[PDB]
Amino acid sequence: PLSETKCTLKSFTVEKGIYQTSNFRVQPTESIVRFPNITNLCPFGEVFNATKFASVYAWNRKRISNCVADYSVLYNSASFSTFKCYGVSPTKLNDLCFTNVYADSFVIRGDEVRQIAPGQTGNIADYNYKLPDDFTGCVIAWNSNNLDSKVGGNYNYLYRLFRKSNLKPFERDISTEIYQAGSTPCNGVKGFNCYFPLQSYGFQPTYGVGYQPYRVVVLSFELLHAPATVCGPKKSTNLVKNKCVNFNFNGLTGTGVLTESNKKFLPFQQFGRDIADTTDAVRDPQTLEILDITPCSFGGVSVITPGTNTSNQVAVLYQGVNCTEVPVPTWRVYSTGSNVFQTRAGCLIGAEHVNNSYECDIPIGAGICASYQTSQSIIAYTMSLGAENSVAYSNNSIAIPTNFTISVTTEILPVSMTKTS
Amino acid sequence: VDCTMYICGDSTECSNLLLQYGSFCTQLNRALTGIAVEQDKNTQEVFAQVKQIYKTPPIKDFGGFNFSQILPDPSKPSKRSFIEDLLFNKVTDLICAQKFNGLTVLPPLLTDEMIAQYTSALLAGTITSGWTFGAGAALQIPFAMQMAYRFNGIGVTQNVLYENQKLIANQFNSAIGKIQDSLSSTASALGKLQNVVNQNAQALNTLVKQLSSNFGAISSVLNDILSRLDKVEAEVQIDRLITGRLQSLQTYVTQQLIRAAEIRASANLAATKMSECVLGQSKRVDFCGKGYHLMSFPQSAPHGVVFLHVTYVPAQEKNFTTA
Amino acid sequence: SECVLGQSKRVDFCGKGYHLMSFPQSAPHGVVFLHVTYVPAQEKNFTTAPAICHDGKAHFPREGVFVSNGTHWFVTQRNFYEPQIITTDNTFVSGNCDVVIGIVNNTVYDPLQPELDSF
Amino acid sequence: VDCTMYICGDSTECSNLLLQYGSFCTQLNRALTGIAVEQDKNTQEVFAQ
Ligand SMILES: *[C@@H]1O[C@H](CO[C@@H]2O[C@@H](C)[C@@H](O)[C@@H](O)[C@@H]2O)[C@@H](O[C@@H]2O[C@H](CO)[C@@H](O)[C@H](O)[C@H]2NC(C)=O)[C@H](O)[C@H]1NC(C)=O
Ligand SMILES: *[C@@H]1O[C@H](CO)[C@@H](O[C@@H]2O[C@H](CO)[C@@H](O)[C@H](O)[C@H]2NC(C)=O)[C@H](O)[C@H]1NC(C)=O
Ligand SMILES: *[C@@H]1O[C@H](CO)[C@@H](O[C@@H]2O[C@H](CO)[C@@H](O)[C@H](O)[C@H]2NC(C)=O)[C@H](O)[C@H]1NC(C)=O
Ligand SMILES: *[C@@H]1O[C@H](CO)[C@@H](O[C@@H]2O[C@H](CO)[C@@H](O)[C@H](O)[C@H]2NC(C)=O)[C@H](O)[C@H]1NC(C)=O
Ligand SMILES: *[C@@H]1O[C@H](CO)[C@@H](O[C@@H]2O[C@H](CO)[C@@H](O)[C@H](O)[C@H]2NC(C)=O)[C@H](O)[C@H]1NC(C)=O
Ligand SMILES: *[C@@H]1O[C@H](CO)[C@@H](O[C@@H]2O[C@H](CO)[C@@H](O)[C@H](O)[C@H]2NC(C)=O)[C@H](O)[C@H]1NC(C)=O
Ligand SMILES: *[C@@H]1O[C@H](CO)[C@@H](O[C@@H]2O[C@H](CO)[C@@H](O)[C@H](O)[C@H]2NC(C)=O)[C@H](O)[C@H]1NC(C)=O
Ligand SMILES: *[C@@H]1O[C@H](CO)[C@@H](O)[C@H](O)[C@H]1NC(C)=O
Ligand SMILES: *[C@@H]1O[C@H](CO)[C@@H](O)[C@H](O)[C@H]1NC(C)=O
Ligand SMILES: *[C@@H]1O[C@H](CO)[C@@H](O)[C@H](O)[C@H]1NC(C)=O
Ligand SMILES: *[C@@H]1O[C@H](CO)[C@@H](O)[C@H](O)[C@H]1NC(C)=O
Ligand SMILES: *[C@@H]1O[C@H](CO)[C@@H](O)[C@H](O)[C@H]1NC(C)=O
């Protein structure tokens, strides 16, 4: 502890005093994982490997639900030529859970894959398929010239070329209404400045990559306070309660002591929150009991020292900590029962609790002070307020001073401080 | 404040980014420690002026003056006076959320029992020895005789004290009863202590509320960021949280430094009134209450001192021709 | 202003004890005041009374306090034991003896009476 | 200070971003209000004796 003092002061000498050197924290005994007990594998092959994809103006959507997804198979597949994730990291994705996953799937030009991203604009982003600016999900695309082209061109794939407005996020518009580019109306028929709003892609196999077909899937992840139904492949551990632990509940990483809760969760509620947004309680996804989450205990570590010229002996106060909590800072050699004293300032280690009272030398708090005293060691005591005295009052007695002493008392006052620019 | 635990919780990823801000957390911890050491000094300079713990005599023959409402009451182990109980049961938030988010309250060095024992000694010295225990050793004097010295001190001849001693004692006892009634029932006078307690509770509450702020990150919950993003992506969001939480904690520390300066100005004034009104008789016109100052009695209050200023107020004036 | 350029009645403002005078000394970024104070010492117990009853009149000290060594009564200044005979000069009269709680009987020396009687 | 009118003017796009900083504008308004209430108290304690 004297070394943590010397370091926090950045000094080899330490004056007499009490110094914050560290904060103590109880370390986790083990790491829990709790996902729902789902064995059904997710049908990603059904969306990524269909014989025929949708046109982007009429883009397909499929719910992925109540299933286990090994997204690392997707990301480490060499086949996908782009695999861009937003609001999530694809490595981390294998240990999250989601209320649902929506797979959106369609075909576009290779040039247009850049438009399938949050905050994009362009013919596809504006008139066919819009991701929200705060999209969480991954966009997965691959060249499909060996599938979605044919000689003479694949007219089966269409895109909306015109609309009166650009789309809202995840809006779809299959409407066949002939579109007015003209100043005059179209009267419901084609004409000058009056066009069918969909155009087909030329997908001749001969075309360069910017005009080759690309199949696209957008895995959209709904992170909600709703229960999880899609999860990564990570296996649930058993639960442990009063031991300090790391945990993962449906992707809620945290640490604490999982006390069995008294809190009366309504059947829809999945998590409890503190006054800060930190998680205060959690429902177990398998047993559906309620657990409190409280942090493993912690506190300031004040080191009590005489000057290093006087001694290298030091006592340690675990501030606000209980002596039933202090572990046998960085070092392990304290909490020896030979010197333990539960002050209201905290558990005090390495000082002898004497019965006397003296003037306060080093303050500890809640009436406690410590000093280095004889065979010298750190003593802790209730500070003395002064000599207790009886004035000898009487209704007819007076004390009159028969002499005097002239006293000279030094008073020092700061007047200025150093002028700086 | 455990500045690392406030800003980062238990995340080492955040802690390692918080190292890149350098000494800011050490500056914050050191400023709050200086404020805390000042609060002990403020209490010491107000109450621990009395060099000996004077005890009152067992029999209270103070010439008809009745201090029983302001002298220590043995019936409680805190050993407060009755009026001290009125104060401690009248001035006296979110402590659990604060504690779990790195914010903690240190106890004062002097307990309320020790502060009550200092006010006890100041009262005993005052009524048994007048001002003399301020200047030196306590010299006993009968209470009616030192009250007659107070009357001379306000320029009223001491025979006016002795010729009216029963009246003056009845008036004092009645006015101490009015202190009891007012402090039992008012909603106004204690506003100076309530305001200080409210300001500090509000400041800690606000500092905890700032942990819910996104500061433009994808979540205010730092464990959401670290469960959902890996280092290169997460660091941008963790840095947004670090920036806003460090600005929140610096705002708190700055305003605590300003409040501590105001509380020290108030403790300097309280220490000056202990010296000049309790240990003395002040000629300073309003310094020890309205009227000509006779004497003052200290009472402890939560984080505060109460002075009961006894003053002579002239009454029933008559018109005279003068030359 | 109040301790160097003056003498302060303010109890602790210029050191512990009754302030006599103070001397300023310069210090780095500071001032040092050497406060000279009178501290009373070697106090003795006396019996005391608020008033003397004499000839049915009540006498009070003009300044100071009445004290007895056990057998005789004196008047003295409050902050230094310097006993004086109780006289009609260092006391003033107000009213009769009946009203003062704890008044004591003693002779009060009139100094003019013997200056007549010795003429 | 109308902290939203100072930082953002009448823009709601800015106002909605300024909400993400949490209570800072409430802290600022409350500090300036405490200063203003103190200025009345300072004048009362000097003159209304
Ligand atoms: C003042 O006197 C008291 C006790 O009074 C005694 O009887 C008087 C009639 C007179 O003869 C006094 O001189 C006597 O002393 C002293 O109080 C005692 O002090 C001692 C310590 O010195 C203590 O052990 C006793 O318990 C005290 N008794 C009481 C009743 O308080 C007091 O010390 C005298 N003051 C001075 C300055 O000497
Ligand atoms: C719900 O229905 C309304 C009306 O059918 C849709 O309104 C369209 O709104 C956009 C602008 O947001 C306009 O450009 C379209 O012209 C509107 N259509 C019609 C026929 O008036 C609305 O978009 C629909 N919302 C969803 C989510 O489908
Ligand atoms: C330190 O911890 C102990 C328990 O480990 C506390 O003592 C217990 O307090 C509860 C009341 O909350 C009692 O019901 C128990 O009987 C007590 N047990 C023992 C063995 O005393 C103690 O109060 C704690 N002290 C501090 C300062 O935190
Ligand atoms: C001094 O004043 C107190 C005022 O509280 C008196 O205390 C009361 O005394 C009676 C008995 O005489 C008790 O029944 C009451 O309960 C007391 N009140 C309290 C609040 O304690 C006390 O009697 C007075 N003493 C003298 C000598 O005047
Ligand atoms: C001085 O004022 C006091 C009141 O503060 C007067 O005392 C009251 O006198 C009435 C009768 O006139 C009594 O009923 C009250 O009980 C008295 N009060 C107290 C506290 O004793 C007193 O008479 C006044 N003296 C003069 C000379 O005017
Ligand atoms: C109280 O003081 C008086 C001082 O006057 C003492 O009496 C005097 O003693 C001297 C001798 O020392 C005599 O010569 C005087 O005649 C005495 N005075 C008078 C007026 O007769 C007295 O002894 C003291 N008493 C105590 C108990 O100390
Ligand atoms: C002080 O002197 C007066 C006399 O001047 C004493 O009063 C007398 O006391 C007796 C009883 O002891 C009565 O019988 C007399 O009537 C009183 N005289 C007068 C004129 O009232 C008084 O007792 C003396 N005090 C002390 C303490 O001895
Ligand atoms: C798609 O089907 C082929 C068989 O034609 C298979 O080899 C391949 O692994 C499948 N891809 C996916 C992603 O399931
Ligand atoms: C999931 O596991 C828990 C035990 O951890 C069990 O009680 C529960 O019935 C299981 N749920 C289902 C749907 O089988
Ligand atoms: C340092 O310790 C030595 C003894 O080892 C002692 O003589 C000296 O006075 C001490 N000085 C200070 C400044 O503590
Ligand atoms: C210290 O004080 C307590 C009582 O306050 C007592 O139980 C204990 O035995 C004392 N220890 C010594 C060594 O006197
Ligand atoms: C002191 O008390 C006694 C009774 O014990 C009484 O006779 C005397 O008048 C009182 N003296 C004073 C000054 O109050």
Residue numbers in the entry:
A (entry chain A): 295 to 622, 631 to 676, 689 to 735
B (entry chain B): 736 to 827, 848 to 1078
C (entry chain A): 1030 to 1148
D (entry chain C): 736 to 784
Quoted from the paper:
S glycoprotein trimers protrude out from the viral membrane and are the major proteins on the viral surface, making it the main target for vaccine design. Sequential cleavage of S at the S1/S2 site followed by the S2’ site within the S2 domain exposes the fusion peptide (FP), which mediates host-viral membrane fusion, allowing entry of the viral genome into the host cell. Overall, the S-trimer structures are similar to those previously determined for B.1 in situ, and are similar across all variants.
Notably, Mu variant has a much lower B-factor in the RBD region, relative to its NTD, indicating that the RBD in Mu variant is structurally more rigid. The majority of S trimers from all strains have all three RBDs in the closed state (hereafter, closed state), ranging from 73% (Mu) to 88% (Delta); the Mu variant has the most populated 1-RBD open state (hereafter, open state), constituting 25%. Using this approach, 30% of the S monomers in the Mu variant are in the locked state, while the locked state was not observed for other variants. In the locked state of Mu variant, a 10 Å displacement of the NTD toward the center of the threefold axis was detected. This 10 Å shift allowed a newly established salt bridge between K113 (NTD) and E471 (RBD), keeping the RBD and NTD more tightly packed. The Mu variant has been reported to be about 10 times more resistant to antibodies elicited by either natural SARS-CoV-2 infection or mRNA vaccination as its parent B.1 strain. The prevalence of the locked state might contribute to this behavior by altering the conformational distribution of the antigenically vulnerable NTD. Our data do not provide an obvious structural explanation for the presence of the locked state in the Mu variant. The D950N mutation induces a structural difference between Delta/Mu (which both contain the D950N mutation) and B.1, indicated by >2 Å Cα RMSD. When aligning the HR1 residues, the position of loop 940–945 in Delta and Mu (N950) differs to B.1 and there is a change in the rotamer conformation of K947; these changes are not observed for Alpha and Gamma (D950).
